[PDB]
Design a protein around this ligand. Sequence first.
Ligand SMILES: O=C(Cc1cccs1)Nc1cc(B(O)O)cc(C(=O)O)c1
Ligand SMILES: O=C(Cc1cccs1)Nc1cc(B(O)O)cc(C(=O)O)c1
Length: 186
Amino acid sequence: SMLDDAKARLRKYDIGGKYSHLPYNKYSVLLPLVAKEGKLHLLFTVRSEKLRRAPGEVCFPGGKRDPTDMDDAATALREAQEEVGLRPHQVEVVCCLVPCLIDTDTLITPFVGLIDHNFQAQPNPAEVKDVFLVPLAYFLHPQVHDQINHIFEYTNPEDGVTYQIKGMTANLAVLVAFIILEKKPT
Ligand SMILES: O=C(Cc1cccs1)Nc1cc(B(O)O)cc(C(=O)O)c1
Ligand SMILES: O=C(Cc1cccs1)Nc1cc(B(O)O)cc(C(=O)O)c1
């Protein structure tokens, strides 16, 4: 099946806990995969205009590890629950992708999660202004704007609203699309 085939692809790139004990400032992100209309999509958040860091920009759900978290995957699920109302029984964490090093002292660990078909987002307005889906296949043929920095522009055909996706968020989206969709019969 489409979902079994995705999980089996993703597991080949799992690094597990290999980098999780290093003495960094630690953040986790959830890359949430949603199946709609026969196809896989990624879920993104638009950050609240009131935040200090990157107000109004597109990112994945996630945040800073705290003392209650059993492991880095726990961080990503706690934060997703608080930001968009995703409950733990509504997500299967499939793997841990390569972590991102930033500013010499910070390590961001990405987890890919398969989301329940009946989940419906409840954005927390203090953190999240908007939630939207992008088909995974978009990231193989993106509409690119050069700011030289590559920015993706995605227009949702439901309402005609255009979003900008860039930076680490754009990089991780393309990575997931390659892992799942490369070399497939049609
Ligand atoms: O950035 C996040 C995680 C999110 C990921 C997606 C939307 S929100 N939290 C945050 C930001 C800020 B800020 O930049 O002002 C202050 C806090 C806080 O602990 O108050 C917490
Ligand atoms: O999480 C982020 C930025 C992101 C990195 C990964 C995705 S979103 N900020 C943040 C700041 C603070 B703070 O002001 O100390 C507390 C948190 C938190 O999650 O508690 C979170």
